[PDB]
Subunit: 121 residues, 4 copies
């Protein structure tokens, strides 16, 4: 499995050691507090009251945890995924990213602690 920290100000995202392969079943658990600028902080689900001003992932609130598997587009992770299987043709290294508008990561703070494990399959 993989365990690490995903910083809110890390625009490129945090590359994990998990390489999702076809047929793999994975489980993710995320926790912690982060912010997209304001002094207030939000959990892995982000800010439910903030407008989407061009986030890297439109299927998740601003300040939420999302991911990219290999070359895929962003995928919502939020508080995590339970025994999850990726869509067809989706594979490669897993990168965890804080959901924010491109180019604005500079004033971000906090981070999410995340566990990723492969389940039986």
């Amino acid at each position: 499995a993989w365990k690490g920290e995903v910083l809110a100000n890390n625009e490129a995202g945090q590359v994990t050691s998990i390489i999702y392969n076809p047929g793999d079943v994975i489980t993710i658990v995320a926790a912690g507090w982060a912010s997209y600028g304001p002094t207030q902080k939000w959990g892995p689900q982000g800010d439910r009251e903030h407008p989407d001003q061009g986030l890297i992932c439109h299927d998740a609130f601003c300040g939420a945890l999302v991911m990219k598997i290999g070359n895929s587009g962003t995928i919502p992770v939020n508080t995590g995924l339970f025994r999850w299987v990726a869509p067809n043709n989706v594979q490669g290294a897993i990168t965890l990213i804080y959901n924010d508008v491109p180019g604005t990561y500079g004033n971000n703070s906090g981070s999410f602690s995340v566990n990723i494990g492969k389940d039986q399959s």
Copy 2:
């Protein structure tokens, strides 16, 4: 494996089908939005800015997800637990509960979608 919702206004708590046994390893994932009264809603980690006014679990914020195992005291769940082992002598059915002051659940709203599974060991 168990999946269900935990209503915030349910003071008694949501009983699952999971019976934790000595040596068991479990993984929990929780998501959703709930409130301990205010119009705003918080994730499974609760409101980090709200004071503790006699919560059922002092190890977690008001509005966070907690649990009891058999006759044990409240245990912080928050966003979930990754391949987690219970303390010695802790066993029995797992009951998921919204962290709030007893007798005040009346004005709660929302719920959490929670998954619980047993891992290999």
Copy 3:
């Protein structure tokens, strides 16, 4: 997980540290060579040609690996079990036993090496 040897001459059987609980999914892999008397040896499947002269397990060949969960009847194991679930709520420690006629274990030789682990459930 549990790993150990099961001697063919051990009539009482080999008690393991595995405590099977209702709902548990288990996997077992047995290997090795043993005999119920003759000079040659057989695998965990036993002797497919030998007649049943009053074996402790009538659902398995003589010289095969069987087991008991708690105080239940014997259960065929053979080469092992793959993600196996018990016949409705059989509970207790797992005892591995060489399949032979009671009171004749005296001239047995060899043993089986066995791994037992609980799977995700």
Copy 4:
């Protein structure tokens, strides 16, 4: 997870749907009766008394179950493998093969019933 039969007379071997990947942990359980010629039949461990006359796998008895992972050499399987990790660089589809001398599979009979699964990691 894969489940199928491996015929003793299939020299090419049986291709499974299991693609082994770096870091993968797998469990195999094999059962049944097969023969490399004689009218007798042996289990997945083969004939412990038979000499090696040029078997595809010199680390297992004749009549034993073995496998190939991708372009790797033969690897002993016998009754199976418990939470097993492959040697470095070894990866690719898993092909199950009956252990025998090349060009002699003609007079073989029987088969092995095999279950392959991936464990959590």
